[PDB]
Amino acid sequence: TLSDWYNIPRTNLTPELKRDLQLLRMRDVVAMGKQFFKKDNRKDFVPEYCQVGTIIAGATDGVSGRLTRKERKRTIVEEVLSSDSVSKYKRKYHEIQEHKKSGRKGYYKKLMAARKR
Amino acid sequence: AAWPKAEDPALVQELLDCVQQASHYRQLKKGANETTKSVNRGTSELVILAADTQPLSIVLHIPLICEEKNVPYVYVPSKVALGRACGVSRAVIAVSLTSNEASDLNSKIRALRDKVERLA
Amino acid sequence: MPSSMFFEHNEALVPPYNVLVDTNFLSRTVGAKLPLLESAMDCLYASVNIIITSCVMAELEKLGPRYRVALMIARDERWQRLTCDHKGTYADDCIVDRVQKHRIYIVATNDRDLKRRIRKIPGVPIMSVQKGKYAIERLPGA
Amino acid sequence: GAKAGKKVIVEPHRHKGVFVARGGKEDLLCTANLVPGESVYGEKRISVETPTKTEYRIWNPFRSKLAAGILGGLETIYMKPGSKVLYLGAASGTSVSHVADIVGPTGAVYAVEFSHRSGRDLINMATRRTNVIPIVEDARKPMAYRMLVPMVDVIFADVAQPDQARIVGINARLFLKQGGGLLISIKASCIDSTAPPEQVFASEVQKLREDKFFPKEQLTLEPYERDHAMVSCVYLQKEFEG
Amino acid sequence: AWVADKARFYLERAAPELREWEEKEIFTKDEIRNLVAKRSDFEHLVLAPGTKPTDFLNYVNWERSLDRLRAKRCARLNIRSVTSHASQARTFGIFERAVLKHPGSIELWLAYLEFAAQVKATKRWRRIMTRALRLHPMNASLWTLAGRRAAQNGDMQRARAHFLRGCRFCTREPTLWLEYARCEMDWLARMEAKKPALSGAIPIAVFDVARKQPFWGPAAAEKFFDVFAKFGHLSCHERIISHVVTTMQELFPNHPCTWSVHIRQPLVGVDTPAFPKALRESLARLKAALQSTTDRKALATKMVAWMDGILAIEKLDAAIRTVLEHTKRSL
RNA sequence: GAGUGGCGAUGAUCUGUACCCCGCGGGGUGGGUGUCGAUGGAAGUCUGACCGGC
RNA sequence: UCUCGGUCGGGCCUCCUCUUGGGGCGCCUAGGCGGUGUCUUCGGGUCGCGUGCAGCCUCCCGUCCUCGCCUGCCGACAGCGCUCUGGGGAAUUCAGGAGGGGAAAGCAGAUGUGCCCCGCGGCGAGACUGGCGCCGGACGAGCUGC
Ligand SMILES: [Zn+2]
C-alpha cells in the first residue's frame, strides 16, 4: 500500500483483472478505428497498485449518461462483449486468418494433390 | 448587489452597441437561461446583465458561475435598452456574447472586457 | 511545440517588435555610424523596443575603453535592460537560451557562428547590418 | 462515454495524491474523496472497497486549471499530502476541494476570495472539509489575513487581474517559504487583450522573475483552454524544497 | 549538541571554588570527586536538548542545598572568609538559562522569584517580576504577588502600578479585583491604624467601575462582600459595605446574595453586648430574608454555609447555637 | 362619460417514451422503471480413519 | 661550513605492464511444447417456426482440417549488450552515499547581592526666552538606568 497515495493497495492480481488490464493495453483495437489512444507500449502492463471502481453519478446527467440494469455488467471485458461490433471483430479476424493461411501448408498440399492427380 | 455597475457616460453605450454587432454576427446568447448555458459551457467571452430587473435575484445567480469560469460580467441599467439592443421585441434581462478564432468583433470583445476589467 | 507557430512561421512576433541586441551588432552599428532605434525602425517600418541583456553589456564592458563610445551608446536609458541570471555571462548561450524559451525576439547579430546557430531553430528573425542599413532574414513582413 | 456504472480501474498518477482511472474507451483524472459520499458541485465519482470506504472524485480540466495543467503535462505541482497551499482566487471552492483532496487530512488549504457569494459556497464546502480555511478578503491586502495564514509551501494563483504578478508578489513576500512553490494560471486576454499571447506570457514570467521567483517550466493549456498558460516557478531558490 | 563544550565552560567556571574547598579543610578529595561528577551530570542534563523545568529545579535544589551544606560544614570547622556568592551567582545562571529556555513555566518563574526573595535580592526580584508579568499577564498569581510584596515593602504607588495594570489585564476571574480591594483596604487599614484616608473612595471606585466588567455577577459581588466583610474596625467600612449592599439592592435586588448581605450587614464592625445584639439583628434580617421570594435553595445553602461558618467561635448562648442547628435542620 | 379583462427570452416552436390493429376514442407486446411477492429457476449442502504422546 | 659542475642509481614524473582466438548472464529469433480459440468437413444432439411434407432454424458434442493467441516455459545458428577472485537468494559484521521526518534546534563578548556618594545620561510635571504661524534656545520639582 502506497503511503502518500492514500493507501491504494497492491494489485490483487486475478485472471479477470488480468484480462481487464490486457483490455486496457488493447483499447485501440476495441474502438475499431473510431477512437485512437495514447500509445502506451510498456512491457509489463500490470501496474503495482490498482483498485477496480465504478462511476457513481453526475448530478446533471441521469437520463442518457447512466447505464441500465442490463448494462451494469461485471467486468470491462463483459462490457466489450456486451457492446456491438463483435461480428466486426470476427470479420476482421477472418480477414487476418484468410491472409495467414495464404501459402502455408494447405496451399502446398493442394499443389501436391494437383500434381499427383 | 450591482457592484459592477456600468456608467451611462458611453460605456453602457459601447456595451449595447457591441451587443448589437454581436447580434448581427450571431455570437449572441440572449436571456438568462441561455446566458447561463453559455457560461456553464464556457463558450462565453463577456456577459452583461440588466439592473432594471424587477426582482434582481433572478439574475443574481450568473455572477457566481462567471466568477467560477472567470468571465467578465457587467450590469447595464435597462433591460429594455438591452432588449432592443439585441433586437428581440421583448426585454432581454441578461445577455452573453461569445467569440471565435478570428474576427474584429473578437477584438472589440477584447477591448470591451479590458474596460470591464478597469471596473472590477 | 511553442504557441503561435504555423510550420516555421511565428505569428507571435508583431509590432512593436522586440529585438535582442548583441555586442557584435552594437560594435558594428557604432562602427557603421548608423543610429540604432531609427535604423531598426527604418528596416522594419515598425515601432521596436530593443532589449540588451546583462551578458551583452557585460561583454561590452569587458572590452576595454577602446569601446567606451559603444558602451555609452549601449546604455541608452530608453531601452529595456533585460536582467539575466546564469553564471556564465556568455551572450551567445544567453541569447539562444532565451530565444529557445520564448521565441518572440528578433536577434540582431552579424557573426556566422550565431546566425548559423539560430537558423536552426524555426521562426526567428535575424537582423544584420550591411554597411548602410540593416537587414532582416526571416520576418515575412516588410 | 464515461457512463455511470462502468467498470474502471484506478492506478496512481505520477504526482503525489493524484489518481488516474482507466476505463474501456476513456480515462479520467481523479482525486481521493476527503469527505466520502458527498460530491461538491455535482460531479461523477468512483467508489471502491479494499480487497464503502474508498472514493475518488473525478476532476475536470474544463472546470479546473490545475487539472488542465496535470493533463497538460506538468513536471511537478509542488503539492503533496501534507503540504500547505495558499489558493488565490477561490470561486466556490471547487478546485479548492480538489487541492484539499490532494493535501488531505494532514494538509491545509488557505482559500482566499474577494466575493461574498463565492464566499458563502466556500464556507459551505469549507464547513464540510476541515483542512481548508475560508478567508474572504481582498488578495491585494495580505495584511488583512496575516493573522490567518502561516508560511505555506505552495501558492496556487488563479485571479483574473491585470496586476496578478504584483498580488502574488506581495502574497509571496508575506506568506511563502524560502524556496517556495508557485503555480500561476495566466489569461493573456485578461492581462493585455491587444498583445500576442506568447508575448504576454513571457512578460508575466519576466515580472515574476524581477519579482524574484525562478521559472522552472511553462506550458500552455491548449487542448482544454485557449490563450491560457500555466507557469510553474519557485520562490528565492532554483530547487524547490530547500 | 555541543553540550560538552558549553558544559565545559560552566564546569571550568565552577572550578576555582572547588580549588578553595579542597585547600580549605572543609570538603575532602573523594567528596570533591562525587561533587565534580554530579555537577557534570547535571550540566549535561541541563544543557541537553530535551529538558524540563523539573530538571532545572532539580539542579537548582541540589546546587542550593550544596551551598547550605558548605555553610553548615563551614560553621562546623569555624572557617570564615569563604563566601556563598559563586553559588548564588551560579544559581542565578541556572535560573536565567532556565527561564530563557522554558519561559512559559510559572513553576520556574515563581521558584526563581522565591530564590530571589530568599537571598534578599530585591531589585533583581523586581526585574524578574516584570519579565514574568510580561510573559504571563493573564496570571492573577503573579499580579497579586507583585502587588502584595510591593505593599509589604511599603511603596503603595508601585503596588497600585502592579495592581491597576493587573486589573487592566486579568479580567476573566474576579480574583485580582478582590485582591486589589483587599490590598487597598489593607492600606486603608494601615492608614486608619496610623491615625484621601478619611474618605477612601478608591475601593468604591473599584466596585462601581467593576460593574461594567465581563465577570460582574451576584456571586462575585458576594465575594466582594467576603473581602470587605473583614477589617470592621475602620472609619468608613459601614459606608463601603452600605454602598455595596445598597448598589446590589439597586441593580440585583432579587438575589440571595443581596439577602445574604442583608443578613450579615450589621455584623461588619463587630468582633461584648453588640455581638448578641447584632446577632439577633441578623435574626430579624434572617427571618425577614428566608421568607423572601428569591432563590430560596441558594439562600438556604448559603445559610447552612454561614451558620456552619460561625461555629468555631466561642462565648455564645448555647440556646442560640442549638436553635441555629435546628434552623439548619429546618431548612 | 367612466371602470375590467390581452401570447412569447421572467423562454415561442421543433426532432423523439415504440411499433402494430381499428372508428380525437379503444386494443397485442414494449423497454426503463419503483415496490411487495413467488412455488419458479441458477442451486447441489464438503472428505471419511486416523492422529497425538512416548 | 658557503656554494658550483658532472654521473648507466633512486625518490618524483611519464606510458605500458588491461581492454583476451576466453567465460558467465541477458536481449533477439527459426522453431518445439503446454494452455487455448476460431475456420473448413462429416456425423450426431437441441430451443423453436412452418404445412408439423419439403424444410427452415438458435444452441450443444465429437471428428476432419488447419491457422491463430498467451507479460506462458524451452530455444539452436547468426548478431548485440552487460559483466568476469563466473551468476543468483538469504542471514549477519563492517565501509560509505542520498533523502525524509522529528528537536528551542538559541556558548556575539559568559563579571554575586544590597545601600550610599560622585560622573554621564534618560523619562518628566512645571516654568521662562530669541528669531520667522512654526522652528529653536535654556531652566527645572521629582523618578529612574548605567
Ligand atoms: Zn544572460
Instruction: Specify whether the CB–CB gap between A49 and A8 falls below 8 A.
Output: yes
C-alpha to C-alpha distance for E210 and E208, rounded to whole angstroms: 5
Q: Do A30 and D25 touch (CB under 8 A)?
A: yes
**Beta strands across the sheet bearing B94-98:** B28-30, B94-98, B44-50, B73-76
CA distance D45 to chain C (A): 34
For A116, residues 6+ apart whose C-beta sits below 8 A from its C-beta are none
Whole-number distance in Å between B98 CA and F15 C1': 26
As given in the structure block, the three cell numbers for residue D182 are 508557485
How many A from CA of C55 to the centre of ligand 1? 5
Give the nearest nucleotide to A100, CA to C1': G67
Cβ of B19 < 7 Å from strand F? no
* Cβ distance of B64 and D92 shorter than 8 Å: yes
- Quickly give D2 CA vs F31 C1' distance in Å: 22
Task: Determine the nucleotide nearest to A44 by Cα–C1' distance.
Answer: G71
Cβ of residue B88 lies below 7 Å from strand F: yes
Distance from CA of A86 to the nearest CA of D (A): 15
Contact between chains at B64 and D162 (C-beta distance less than 8 A): no
C9 is in an annotated binding site: no
Q: What are the chain D neighbours of B107 within 8 Å (beta carbons)?
A: 194
| Chain G footprint positions (protein CB, under 7 Å) | 37-39, 65-68, 71, 99-101, 103-107, 110-115, 145
Give the residue on D whose Cα is nearest the Cα of B109.
D193
Which positions of strand F lie within 7 Å of protein CB atoms? 8-11, 31-34
Interatomic CA–C1' length for residue A46 and nucleotide G73, angstroms: 20
Q: Which grid coordinates are listed for E19?
A: 580549588
- Closest-approach nucleotide to residue A109, Cα vs C1': G66
Candidates D147, D124, D62, D133; CA nearest to D99 is D133
Q: CB distance from D181 to chain C under 8 Å? A: no
* B64, B111, B113: residue with CB nearest D118: B64
Closest nucleotide (CA of A70 to C1')? F32
Judged by CB atoms closer than 8 Å, whether chains meet at B67 and D193 is answered as no
CA pair distance A78, D84, nearest whole angstrom: 44
- Is residue D80 a contact partner of residue D86, using CB atoms and an 8 Å limit? no
Strand order in the sheet with D176-187: D132-136, D108-113, D84-88, D152-157, D176-187, D228-235, D215-220
Alpha helix (H) residue ranges in chain D: 65-70, 94-103, 116-128, 164-175, 188-191, 197-209
Q: Is the CB of A47 under 7 A from strand G?
A: no
Rounded CA gap, C24 and A101, in Å? 70
Q: In a 3-state reduction of DSSP, which class is residue C21?
A: strand
Query: Which of D198, D214, D222 has the CB atom closest to C102's CB atom?
Result: D198
| B57 CB neighbours strand F below 7 A | no
CA of C92 and C1' of G14: distance in angstroms?
Answer: 40
Before C16, cis peptide (omega within 30)?
yes
- Give the CA-to-C1' distance from C55 to G1 in angstroms: 63
Cell 535575424 locates to C126
Strand-pairing partners, residue C135, are C128
A65 with D3: CB under 8 angstroms? yes
Mutation pick from D10, D11, D33, D49 vs chain A, by most beta carbons of A within 10 Å, is: D11
Please compute, for residue B104, the number of CA atoms within 13 A of its CA located in the half-sphere on the CB side: 2
How many residue pairs bridge chain B and chain D with CB atoms within 8 Å of each other?
A: 41
Cell numbers describing residue D126: 469549507
CA D71, A44, A90: angle at the middle one, nearest 5? 90
Per the entry, the structure determination technique was cryo-EM
Question: How far is residue E118 from each of residues C9, C106, E61, E72, measured CA to CA in Å?
Answer: 90, 83, 13, 18
Whole-number Cα distances in Å, C15 to B10, B111, C12, E284: 30, 18, 10, 104
Query: Is residue C122 classed exposed, middle or buried when 0-12, 13-18 and 19+ CB atoms within 10 A define those classes?
Result: middle
The one-letter amino acid code at D203 reads S
CA–CA min distance D49, chain C (Å):
42
d(CA C2, CA D218): 10
Q: Which residues does chain A have within 8 Å of residue D17's beta carbon, measured at their own beta carbons?
A: 4-6
Q: Tell whether D100 is within 8 A of chain A (Cβ).
A: no
Number of H helices, E strands in chain C: 6, 6
D197 at C interface, C-beta within 8 A? yes
Rounded to an integer, what distance in angstroms lies between the CA atom of residue E86 and that of residue E90? 6
The whole-angstrom distance between A70's CA and the closest CA on chain D is 11
Residue in B63, B68, B114 nearest the CB of D193: B114
Cell readout for E29 is 578529595
Least Cα separation, residue D133 to chain B (angstroms): 19
Whole-number Å distance, alpha carbon E152 to ligand 1 midpoint, is 75
Element containing residue D220 per DSSP (H, E): strand D215-220
C-beta contacts of E152-159 below 8 A and 24+ residues apart: E153/E122, E156/E187, E159/E183, E159/E187
Measuring CA to CA, which residue among A99, C85, A56 is closest to residue D233? C85
In the reported structure, the alpha carbon of residue D79 is separated from the centroid of ligand 1 by a whole-number distance in angstroms of 31
Alpha helices in chain E (DSSP H): 3-23, 29-47, 53-76, 85-101, 106-118, 122-135, 140-153, 156-169, 175-194, 202-210, 218-228, 237-251, 256-264, 274-290, 296-307, 318-330
Q: Considering only CA atoms, which residue is closest to the C1' of nucleotide F32? A: A68
DSSP readout, E238-263? HHHHHHHHHHHHHHS-SSHHHHHHHH
Q: How many residues does chain E have?
A: 331
Q: How far apart are CA E184 and CA E171, in angstroms?
A: 18
Nearest chain A alpha carbon to D42:
A59
The gap between D51 CA and F48 C1' (Å) is 35
Neighbouring C-beta atoms of residue B111, cutoff 10 Å: 13
d(Cα E110, Cα E97) in Å, to the nearest integer?
15
Q: Which residues contact B32 (CB under 8 A, 6 or more apart)?
A: B58, B59, B62, B93, B94
- C83, C85, C104 ranked by CB distance to D198: nearest: C104
Residue D178 and residue D238 in contact, taking contact as beta carbons nearer than 8 Å? no
Which chain D residues contact residue A31 at CB under 8 A?
Answer: 25
Is the CB of residue A93 inside 7 Å of nucleic acid strand G?
A: yes
Which residues, numbered 82 to 121 in chain D, qualify as contacts with chain C under a Cβ-Cβ cut-off of 8 Å? none
CB B79 within 8 A of CB B111: no
* Residue A109: CB less than 7 A from any atom in strand G: yes
Q: For residue D232, what are the CA distances in angstroms to A110, B70, D104, D108, D173?
A: 69, 20, 22, 20, 17
Please give, rounded to a whole number of angstroms, the shortest distance from the CA of B70 to a CA of chain D: 7
**What number of helices (H) and strands (E) belong to chain B?**
5, 4
Alpha-carbon distance D12 to D19, whole Å?
A: 4
The resolution of the experimental structure, rounded to one decimal in Å, is 3.2
